[PDB]
Structure 1
Amino acid sequence: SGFRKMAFPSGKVEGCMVQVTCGTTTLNGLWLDDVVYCPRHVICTSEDMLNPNYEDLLIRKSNHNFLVQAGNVQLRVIGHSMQNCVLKLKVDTANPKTPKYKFVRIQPGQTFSVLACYNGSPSGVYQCAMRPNFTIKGSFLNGSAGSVGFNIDYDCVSFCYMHHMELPTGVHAGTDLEGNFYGPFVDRQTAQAAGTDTTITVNVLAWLYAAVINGDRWFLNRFTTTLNDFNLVAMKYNYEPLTQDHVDILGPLSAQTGIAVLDMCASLKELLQNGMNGRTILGSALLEDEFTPFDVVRQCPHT
């Protein structure tokens, strides 16, 4: 038993982590085949990061203005090209450690592992959710731009995130690996703020099921509710509407436990209106919403 925020093993990402230096800006790049992906702000000087002309600053850069470094191996930079808000540095060496990979764009609600990295050195891995407002609540320090988020399914790494910047509120923002930002953010120094956040109801329901599957059942009650009666309580406490597809998605989990989706809603609704009265669920005093239904199933096979 047990249930922990768990991240995929990072070994396959670790051998793609490299370090990129243009002038005195240093960050991390991703090394796939003979291309190295890095935030395009590595080309910006600390005096040019307010409203920068990226198309203009890149041309000036020659290849030798880019220092790429995988561990202590130097990589020749043979070409440079703009991939939206990221940069594709062509190198002379294909990464001998390139994993089977794909780039996918996640939707809000979905989760992924993050491999915190600094100066091309990975430092730690942990599990994040793409919030409804397209930020993520991670732990990135200065120079961690270029750390990536990935899901690993069987053997194929799906890269879904590349960290770019911190919002003035402490949350983080980045692009997919095709260089397109998540949400309404730009890679300039403006007064961007995260949209107002909301809780991801399906993930809480999923995690409630994970609690039941592990023998935490004190919150279960005899009431039941209509989707719409629930969703109006959901609106009140800043929670996303639950849709029929969510209820479909919660199907498998509802059958492994034999607790109707709408019966669990009745528990969640009680918990939002009255609180937990000093109890905890799966070790937490708060409702956790960064576990997808698929994530619950990984640690709780039906068997």
Structure 2
Amino acid sequence: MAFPSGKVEGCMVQVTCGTTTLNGLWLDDVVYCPRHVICTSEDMLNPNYEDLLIRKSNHNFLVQAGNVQLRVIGHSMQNCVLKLKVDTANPKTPKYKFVRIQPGQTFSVLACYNGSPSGVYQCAMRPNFTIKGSFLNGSAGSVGFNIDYDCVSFCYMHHMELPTGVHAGTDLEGNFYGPFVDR
């Protein structure tokens, strides 16, 4: 059984940089999202994420929570996740922790397409640190979580599909699960 998704639904936003838009997680005054939102159609072969994040402005980021626009007042990169500081804290932030899970352990995924929640799925990571599921197609930035009492433990952020059809992502500190690199 998947966990109820209401507490996570209230944290999902849309993050746009140029012609890349994907899902982000809005907790307190920070928006977390995959760092490869700063790449374009050519910056995926070999990117210099250090150069790129310096080369971008706060106004180069479009953060929308439904029809509310959020102004980025600063950006940094924690491993493989971009952390966007915004001018207002999420009033719907639940109690949360960031945890790292192991293959075999199940968690719920709230699949989102363009910031809008589509479905809730229970999955588990395979021993190769991948998740099998066509439900994650196009849903980069969707998260995985468990709930204990009143507290949401975020454990996963979807990043990209592999040529093999499987999916790969990080924990909420930007550390990938398994041997993968966003390139």
**Aligning the two structures, in what range does the TM-score lie when normalised by the shorter sequence?**
over 0.9
Q: Larger RCO: Structure 1 or Structure 2 (Cα < 8 Å, ≥ 6 residues apart)?
A: 2
Taking every aligned residue pair, what percent have the same amino acid on both sides? 100
Structure having the higher strand fraction is 2
Gaps of 5+ in 2: none
1:73-94 alpha-carbon deviations (Å, 9 max, x no partner): 0001000000100100000010
Whether the 8 Å contact between 1:164 and 1:173 is mirrored in structure 2 is yes
Distance 2:138 2:179 in 1: 23
**Secondary structure at 1:42's aligned position in 2?**
helix
- Deviation at 1:143? 3.5
Question: Do 2:80 and 2:174's aligned partners in 1 also have CA atoms closer than 8 Å?
Answer: yes
1:94 aligned residue (89, 92, 101): 89
| SS of equivalent to 1:56 | helix
CA contact (8 A) 1:18 1:30 kept: yes
Shift of 1:142: 4.9
SS in 1 for 2:110: strand
Shift of 1:130: 1.2
Q: Deviations over 1:183-231 (max 9, x none)?
A: 000100xxxxxxxxxxxxxxxxxxxxxxxxxxxxxxxxxxxxxxxxxxx
The equivalent residue for 2:150 is: 155
- State how many pairs are aligned: 183
Distance 1:87 1:36 in 2: 8
The CA deviation at 1:119 is: 1.1
- How far does residue 140 in structure 1 lie from its aligned partner after superposition? 4.1
1:160 and 1:89, CA in 2 relative to 1: closer, same or farther beyond 3 A? Answer: same
Aligned position for 2:114: 119
Matches of 1:106 and 1:74, distance apart in 2: 33
Contact 1:115–1:123 (Cα < 8 Å) also in 2: yes
State the superposition RMSD in angstroms: 0.9
The runs of at least 4 consecutive aligned structure 1 residues that moved more than 2 Å come to: 138-143
Shift in Å at residue 138 of structure 1?
Answer: 2.2
1:28 and 1:143 in contact (8 A); partners too: no
Q: Is the 8 A contact 2:38 2:52 kept in 1?
A: yes
- Which has more radius of gyration? 1
User: Is the 8 Å Cα contact of residues 137 and 161 (structure 2) preserved in structure 1?
Assistant: no
Is residue 136–residue 167 contact of structure 2 (8 Å, CA) maintained in 1?
no
Higher helix share: 1
Deviation (angstroms), 1:139: 2.7
Contact 1:19/1:120 (CA < 8 Å) preserved in 2? yes
Partner of 2:23: 28
